[PDB]
């Protein structure tokens, strides 16, 4: 389930992070511009940057301490608002952080790996909907 | 299912309030104690007795407005918050409140309803579990 999931996501971290975070820049090539350091860029060259590695595994570490601390995938307030606050996310809106689920979501169906995909679907619609309520557009 | 649930106990709220209740006070023999006025006295007697009324009907107004504003069957921090400050609450644990919900799910499952239970049941534990957040021992 949901619980067993974050520890399959955190055993392997680097390679989930950068396997879903790839699934979503090719699902929704528009996000790509918010990372000018990623434009121009096919998947396996991103993979030689360090900034690539660096980044990815410090927004899944951080998304996997939101989704431990959640309850019921319902994330907590103060979570929302840590991601609101963040100067790097100063410009997002919540259709921003739909796209991604909706990424990691398809992700894991098309996985080998026996995810619970609706639970992630539920969680990302929930952070979703505390996002807007902790202050973002 | 959880949603409809709140307007089916609106739309009969004194009579659902008082029966739920009950189940709970006949249940949990026990937790009579907490209101001195009650111990001694019949269902028959209760249902006479002027703050029983309008104290089950308060409890539950609140408890399904409670309801209404959870995501997920989580009810909001602020909630939970109300609930542990409340005077009344000063000397109860998480435990009064397991056992409140435990009664009114049973209820749900022997009533000729269409009840969504299980999300009660969620509902009773997140309510436990944000109490706890909130200070309730
Ligand atoms: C639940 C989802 C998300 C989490 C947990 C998260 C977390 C993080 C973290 C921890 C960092 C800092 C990384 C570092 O300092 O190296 C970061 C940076 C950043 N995030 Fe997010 N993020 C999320 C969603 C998004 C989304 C949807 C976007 C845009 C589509 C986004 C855009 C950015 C950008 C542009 C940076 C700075 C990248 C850079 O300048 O190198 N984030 N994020
Ligand atoms: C989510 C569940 C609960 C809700 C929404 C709730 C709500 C309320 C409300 C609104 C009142 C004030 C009613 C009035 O002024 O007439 C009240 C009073 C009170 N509550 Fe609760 N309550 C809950 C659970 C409990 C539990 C589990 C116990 C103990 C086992 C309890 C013990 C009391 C007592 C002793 C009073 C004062 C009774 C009196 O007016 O004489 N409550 N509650
Ligand atoms: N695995
Ligand atoms: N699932
Ligand atoms: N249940």
């Given at each position: 389930?949901?619980?067993?999931?974050?520890?399959?996501?955190?055993?392997?971290?680097?390679?989930?992070?950068?396997?879903?975070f790839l699934a979503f820049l090719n699902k929704y090539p528009?996000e790509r511009?918010?990372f000018?350091?990623y434009?121009?860029?096919?998947?396996?060259?991103?993979?030689?940057?360090?900034?690539?590695?660096?980044?990815?595994?410090?927004?899944?570490?951080?998304?996997?301490?939101?989704?431990?601390?959640?309850?019921?995938?319902?994330?907590?307030?103060?979570?929302?608002?840590?991601?609101?606050?963040?100067?790097?996310?100063?410009?997002?809106?919540?259709?921003?952080?739909?796209?991604?689920?909706?990424a990691?979501?398809?992700?894991?169906?098309?996985?080998?790996?026996?995810?619970?995909?609706?639970?992630?679907?539920?969680?990302?619609?929930?952070?979703?909907?505390?996002?807007?309520?902790?202050?973002?557009?």
């Amino acid at each position: 389930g949901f619980k067993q999931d974050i520890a399959t996501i955190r055993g392997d971290l680097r390679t989930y992070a950068q396997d879903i975070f790839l699934a979503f820049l090719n699902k929704y090539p528009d996000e790509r511009r918010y990372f000018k350091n990623y434009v121009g860029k096919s998947d396996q060259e991103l993979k030689s940057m360090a900034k690539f590695g660096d980044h990815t595994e410090k927004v899944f570490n951080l998304m996997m301490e939101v989704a431990d601390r959640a309850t019921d995938c319902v994330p907590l307030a103060s979570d929302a608002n840590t991601l609101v606050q963040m100067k790097q996310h100063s410009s997002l809106t919540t259709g921003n952080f739909e796209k991604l689920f909706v990424a990691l979501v398809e992700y894991m169906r098309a996985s080998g790996q026996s995810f619970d995909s609706q639970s992630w679907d539920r969680f990302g619609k929930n952070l979703v909907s505390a996002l807007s309520s902790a202050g973002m557009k």
